[PDB]
C-alpha cells in the first residue's frame, strides 16, 4: 500500500490516497476528511499575506470554513483502496518533517 505515495519537493510534502478521521480540540469530533494543497507562487494580494500555498480541508466532499485550526491530535488514517489502517505511517511520518501538513491528498500546480 506504500507504492502509491509520492514525495513532492517543490512544496516538500507527500501525496497519497488516504482519509483522515481527525479530532478537534474541546471534544469536537470530525468525521472522515482529506487535505488539498494548491501551489500558487504568482499571488496578487499583499501586505497581510504571508504564505505561498493554499491548504483546504474537504469533509465528505463539501467545503468547511475554518474557525479554530488547532486539531493536532492525529487522525484515524485509513487507505480507502482496501480500508487498511495506515494511521501509524502518518503519525510517525509527521514529526520527521517540518511541514505543518505532511500528507495532502492531491496537489495542484499553478506555475
Amino acid at each position: 500500500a506504500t507504492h502509491d505515495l509520492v514525495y513532492h519537493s517543490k512544496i516538500n510534502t507527500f501525496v497519497w490516497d488516504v482519509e483522515f478521521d481527525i479530532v478537534l480540540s474541546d471534544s469536537k469530533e470530525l468525521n472522515k476528511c482529506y487535505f488539498v494543497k494548491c501551489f500558487n507562487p504568482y499571488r496578487i494580494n499583499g501586505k497581510c499575506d504571508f504564505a505561498v500555498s493554499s491548504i483546504d480541508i474537504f469533509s465528505e466532499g463539501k467545503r468547511l470554513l475554518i474557525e479554530n485550526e488547532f486539531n493536532f491530535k492525529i487522525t484515524k488514517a485509513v487507505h480507502v483502496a482496501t480500508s487498511k489502517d495506515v494511521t501509524e505511517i502518518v503519525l510517525h511520518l509527521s514529526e520527521r518533517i517540518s511541514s505543518p501538513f505532511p500528507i495532502v491528498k492531491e496537489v495542484v500546480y499553478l506555475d
Binding site: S9, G46, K47, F70, V108
Partner: protein, 645 residues
C-alpha cells in the same frame, strides 16, 4: 516505383529502365510550340493532366528547381470549423452522389451519427452500378468506421460511470441500437478490397491501406530523425509530410481523422518538431553568440499549426510542451485568421449553450477543442470586440461541469497577458460578479478545484485599476440585511469594490471581539488597518501563550512585525518558545545553527524580496549553497537564481 516524388514538388528517376516518359511530359509542359502535334483529343488529355498536376503541386524535376513556395491550403469547411455553414449546407436537397457523400461526412462530424449511418446505407444501396466504385468503397469504409465509433462511444460512455449527468440523455435508443449488430454480425474489413472487381483492384491499388487497422506506422517510425543530436533538413520535410497527410485525410471526407492513432501521431510530430527547434536554438546561442541571430526561433508558426495544436492536444500535453519547450521566445504568424477562428468558436459555444441542443456525442468532442484553443490563445493578440466576445463566452455561457471558477480565472488571467484590461471586459467581469452575487441569494455554495474563488477576480481588477467603484453591488448590499449569512460573507470577500456608504454598511457588521475573530478577519483581509485595540489583543494573546508554558500561529505575527505592519517594540521580550519567532523578531541574536531552509520553500515573492534586501543575507546564502551542493533541487536553485544573487 519508376519515380520518387520529393514533397517540395519535384520528381526523380530511380527504378525506371525504359523511356523517360515523365521527362517527356514535363518537356511538353515547358515548351509551347509542342502543341498542335497531337490529334485533338490528346490535346484535351494533356490539358486535363496538366490541370490535375497543377492542382496537386507537382512542377518540375530536381535539376530544374526554381525555389519552392510550398504553400498549403485546405478548402474543407470541416477543417476550419465553419459549423453554421455546413449545418446550412446539409439542409439543401442533394444533386449528385458525391454531394450525399459530403453531406454524410458533415453529419458524422456534427455528431448526428444515426443520420450519417442511414445516409451511408442509402449511398451504398444506390451506388452499386457504374465504374465509380471508389465512392462505394469509401462509403463502406466510412460506415464501418462509424459503426466502430458508435460501439466504442456506447461502451465507454454508456455505462461505466458518469458524473456529468445522472442518465446519458439516451445516446441512441435501443431501436437504432441492436439493429447495427444484426447488420454487422460478422462483417470483415480485411477482405473488402479482395472482393472488388479486378479493374478496381488494378486501378485503385493506392486505396488498399484504407482497409487496414494501422496505416500510419511509416511516419511514426520516420519521426526518429528529429531526435538526432548530430550537428532540405528533416523538420521541413516532416512538416510537409504532416500537411500532406492532413490534407488528404480531410479533403476526401474520411472519418478516420477522428480516431486515437491520428491524434497521437499529430501530437508526437508537433512535440518532436518543437523540441528539435528549441534544442537547435539553444545550441546555436550556446556555441556562437547571444543575439547574433535576432533572438527569434526559426519555427515560424501560422494558422494551420495553431489549428492542429488546438484540435489534437489535450490540456496536459499542452502544459508539458509549455513547461519543457517554452514558446514565449518564438512569435506567431497570422493573427486575423486566428482571431476569426477564436470568435467563431466562441460564437459556436454560446449557440450550443443558448439553444440547449447539446448533442452529447458532439459536445464531448467539441469541449476539448474549445478548452485547448482558449488555453493556447494566450500567445495571440486580439482586437477589442473579439476579446470582449471571447471573454463573455468564457465567463457566461461556458458549461460549469468542465471549468470551475478557479479554472475560469486561470484561463482569463492567461488571456490578458499581452492585451491588458480595457473598460469593456472589466464591465463584463462586473456583470459576472453582480451575477454571481445574485446567484448567491438558499443553501448554495460555490465549488472550485484549485481553491480559487470569485474574490480573486476583484483582486485582479483592483490590481489593474485601483479607482473603480461598482454601483450595482453597492446598491445590492445597501438593502442587504442580517438575516442572510453566506451572501454577507461573499460581500466581505469582495470588500474593496464597494462605495463609501456600502463600505460603512458592511464595516458596521465587522466586529473584532476575539483573537480567533481577528484571525478570521485577516484571512480575507477585512481589517487592513492595525488599531491599538488589535495590537493590545495580540499582546494579551502572546502573554497568555507565554504564561501557558501543535499547530503554528505565532508565524503570522512574526511575518507582520518583520513586514513593519506592527510599529511597536513589544514582542521582543517573548523569546525561547520557537525558532522562527526569534528569527523574525531578533535577527541579530538568532542562533543560525537551528535554521532549516525548508521554510524558504513556503515564502512568497514579497517576503523573499524583503529578506533578500536585508543584511542575514550571507548566512542563508551559505546554508542554501550547502543544500544545493548536497542535493540538486530545483527550488533552492531558483531561490538563489532570481533573488539572492
Amino acid at each position: 516505383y519508376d519515380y520518387h516524388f520529393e514533397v517540395n514538388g519535384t520528381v526523380v528517376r530511380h527504378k525506371n529502365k525504359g523511356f523517360g516518359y515523365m521527362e517527356r511530359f514535363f518537356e511538353l509542359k515547358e515548351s509551347c510550340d509542342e502543341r498542335s502535334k497531337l490529334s485533338k483529343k490528346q490535346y484535351e488529355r494533356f490539358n486535363a493532366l496538366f490541370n490535375f498536376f497543377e492542382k496537386n503541386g507537382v512542377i518540375c524535376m530536381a535539376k530544374d528547381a526554381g525555389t519552392l513556395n510550398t504553400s498549403i491550403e485546405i478548402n474543407s469547411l470541416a477543417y476550419h470549423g465553419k459549423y453554421d455553414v455546413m449545418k446550412k449546407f446539409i439542409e439543401e436537397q442533394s444533386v449528385s452522389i458525391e454531394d450525399d457523400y459530403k453531406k454524410a461526412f458533415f453529419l458524422a462530424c456534427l455528431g448526428r451519427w444515426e443520420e450519417s449511418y442511414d445516409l451511408y446505407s442509402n449511398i451504398i444501396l444506390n451506388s452499386i452500378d457504374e465504374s465509380n466504385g471508389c465512392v462505394y468503397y469509401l462509403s463502406q469504409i466510412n460506415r464501418y468506421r462509424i459503426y466502430q465509433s458508435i460501439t466504442q462511444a456506447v461502451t465507454q460512455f454508456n455505462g461505466l460511470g458518469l458524473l456529468t449527468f445522472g442518465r446519458h440523455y439516451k445516446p441512441f435508443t435501443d431501436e437504432f441500437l441492436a439493429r447495427i449488430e444484426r447488420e454487422m454480425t460478422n462483417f470483415n474489413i480485411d477482405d473488402l478490397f479482395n472482393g472488388m472487381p479486378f479493374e478496381f483492384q488494378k486501378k485503385y491499388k493506392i486505396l488498399e491501406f484504407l482497409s487496414d487497422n494501422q496505416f500510419l506506422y511509416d511516419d511514426t517510425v520516420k519521426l526518429f530523425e528529429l531526435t538526432n543530436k548530430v550537428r532540405m533538413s528533416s523538420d521541413i520535410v516532416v512538416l510537409l509530410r504532416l500537411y500532406d497527410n492532413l490534407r488528404f485525410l480531410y479533403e476526401n471526407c474520411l472519418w478516420s481523422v477522428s480516431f486515437h492513432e491520428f491524434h497521437q501521431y499529430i501530437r508526437n510530430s508537433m512535440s518532436l518538431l518543437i523540441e528539435k527547434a528549441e534544442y537547435e536554438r539553444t545550441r546555436d546561442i550556446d556555441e556562437l553568440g547571444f543575439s547574433f541571430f535576432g533572438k527569434k526561433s526559426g519555427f515560424f508558426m501560422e494558422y494551420y499549426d495553431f489549428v492542429n495544436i488546438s484540435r489534437h492536444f489535450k490540456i496536459d500535453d499542452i502544459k508539458n510542451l509549455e513547461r519543457s519547450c517554452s514558446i514565449d521566445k518564438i512569435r506567431f504568424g497570422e493573427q486575423e485568421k486566428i482571431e476569426e477562428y477564436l470568435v467563431g468558436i466562441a460564437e459556436e459555444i454560446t449557440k450550443q449553450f443558448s439553444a440547449n441542443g447539446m448533442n452529447v456525442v458532439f459536445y464531448t468532442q467539441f469541449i476539448s477543442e474549445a478548452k485547448a484553443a482558449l488555453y493556447f490563445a494566450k500567445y495571440v493578440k486580439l482586437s477589442e470586440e473579439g476579446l470582449g466576445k471571447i471573454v463573455k463566452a468564457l465567463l457566461f455561457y461556458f458549461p460549469e461541469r468542465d471549468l470551475d471558477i478557479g479554472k475560469r480565472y486561470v484561463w482569463l488571467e492567461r488571456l490578458t497577458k499581452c492585451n491588458e484590461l480595457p473598460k469593456s471586459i472589466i464591465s463584463i467581469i462586473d456583470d459576472f460578479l453582480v451575477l454571481q452575487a445574485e446567484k448567491h441569494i438558499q443553501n448554495y455554495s460555490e465549488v472550485s478545484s484549485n481553491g480559487l474563488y470569485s474574490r480573486d477576480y476583484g483582486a485582479l481588477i483592483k490590481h489593474f485599476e485601483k479607482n473603480f467603484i461598482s454601483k450595482r453591488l453597492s446598491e445590492i448590499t445597501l438593502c442587504l440585511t442580517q438575516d442572510k449569512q453566506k451572501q454577507i460573507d461573499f460581500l466581505f470577500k469582495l470588500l474593496p469594490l464597494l462605495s463609501t456608504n456600502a463600505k460603512s454598511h458592511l464595516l458596521s457588521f465587522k466586529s473584532v471581539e476575539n483573537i480567533n475573530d481577528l484571525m478570521n478577519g485577516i484571512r480575507i483581509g477585512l481589517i487592513d488597518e492595525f488599531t491599538p485595540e488589535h495590537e493590545e489583543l495580540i499582546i494579551e494573546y502572546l502573554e497568555t501563550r507565554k504564561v501557558n508554558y501543535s499547530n503554528d500561529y505565532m508565524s503570522t505575527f512574526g511575518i507582520w512585525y518583520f513586514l513593519e505592519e506592527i510599529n511597536n517594540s513589544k514582542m521582543e521580550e517573548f523569546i525561547g518558545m520557537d525558532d522562527q519567532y526569534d528569527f523574525f523578531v531578533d535577527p541579530e541574536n538568532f542562533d543560525y545553527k537551528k535554521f532549516i531552509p525548508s521554510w524558504l520553500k513556503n515564502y512568497n515573492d514579497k517576503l523573499l524580496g524583503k529578506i533578500a534586501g536585508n543584511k542575514m543575507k550571507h548566512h542563508v546564502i551559505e546554508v542554501l549553497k550547502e543544500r544545493v551542493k548536497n542535493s540538486n533541487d530545483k527550488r533552492y536553485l531558483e531561490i538563489l537564481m532570481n533573488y539572492f544573487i
